[PDB]
């Protein structure tokens, strides 16, 4: 079973600008662990597979969360620390292009379709249950969980938004953008560490340990 009520409850329970962004991301990695523990059946996976899924998905999972948090912000994002990052500030820090991708491909699209927190939570749970993550002890088990999430999400969409038959597909089709943006953010983070001019806290730093890609 994979009830969307549990997924929403998980969202509601966890309810240099680049330095501020790194500080917020490290903070939210702790909260991400507590969120995942609230997603049905995640905690019943083998401990090493829980590690794999979170190491593989953390950047997309965090991006989805702060993007949805920012749907009412104009030309900016709300960090979990209560700070706002304006697109002019991101641009002034040398990360304007990828920041604009988040605003254009994620935040604005979430705003335009009024993606709700149940839908957000379900998309994040799909990202979490990534059966292509390398090293999983039982990929089919993770694929089965992803399939239960999407089945539940579609039923929710069809019941709450029956006038929008394409809505379920529209939600899923933000995931390629999320994957591209997540990959680019990781590239930036490896550069920040290489140059050494940006503090990176311990949990964020641990995500940079091998394995990579």
């Amino acid at each position: 079973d994979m009830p969307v009520e549990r997924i929403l409850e998980a969202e509601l329970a966890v309810e240099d600008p680049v330095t501020n962004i790194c500080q917020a991301a490290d903070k939210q990695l702790f909260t991400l662990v507590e969120w995942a523990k609230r997603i049905p059946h995640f905690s019943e996976l083998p401990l090493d597979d829980q590690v794999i899924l979170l190491r593989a998905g953390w950047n997309e999972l965090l991006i989805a969360s702060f993007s949805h948090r920012s749907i009412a912000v104009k030309d900016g994002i709300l960090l979990a620390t209560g700070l706002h990052v304006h697109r002019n500030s991101a641009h002034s820090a040398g990360v304007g292009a990828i920041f604009d991708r988040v605003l254009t491909e994620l935040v604005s699209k979430m705003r335009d379709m009024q993606m709700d927190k149940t839908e957000l939570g379900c998309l994040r749970a799909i990202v979490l249950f990534n059966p292509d993550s390398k090293g999983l002890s039982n990929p089919a088990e993770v694929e089965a969980l992803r399939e239960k999430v999407y089945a539940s999400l579609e039923a929710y969409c069809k019941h709450k938004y029956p006038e929008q038959p394409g809505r379920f597909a529209k939600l899923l089709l933000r995931l390629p953008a999320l994957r591209s943006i997540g990959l680019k953010c990781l590239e930036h983070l490896f550069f920040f560490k290489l140059i050494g001019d940006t503090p990176i806290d311990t949990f964020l730093m641990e995500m940079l340990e091998a394995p990579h890609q």
């Binding site: 702790f30 523990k37 401990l47 829980q50 590690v51 979170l54 190491r55 311990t202 641990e206």
Partner: peptide, 12 residues
């Protein structure tokens, strides 16, 4: 061996 993540996952 992903020390922080393991510790946070294993606890209650």
């Amino acid at each position: 061996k992903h020390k922080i993540l393991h510790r946070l996952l294993q606890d209650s």
